[PDB]
């Protein structure tokens, strides 16, 4: 059981690693579920890549804010 929750600051973004593979869900301002994309963390390696890879694709679908407010630069 892997549930989706708003990605930290992203007003309408969801990200949960469905098992060993990753599942992304993006909503609209009206909260309409737009996109559900799948990733795999096995290719990446670690937890940060898990979140950081999700944000990359999802942002252009309506994900705008921050997942880890620590200024990753």
């Amino acid at each position: 059981m892997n549930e989706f929750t708003q990605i930290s600051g992203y007003v309408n973004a969801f990200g949960s690693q469905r098992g060993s593979v990753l599942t992304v869900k993006v909503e609209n301002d009206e909260g309409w579920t737009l996109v559900e994309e799948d990733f795999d963390r096995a290719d990446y390696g670690s937890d940060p890549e898990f979140v950081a890879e999700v944000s990359s694709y999802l942002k252009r679908n309506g994900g705008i804010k921050d997942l880890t407010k620590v200024l990753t630069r």
Partner: peptide, 10 residues
């Protein structure tokens, strides 16, 4: 798996 959305907000 144990990570999920919980990893994002951290």
């Amino acid at each position: 798996m144990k990570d999920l959305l919980n990893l994002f907000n951290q």
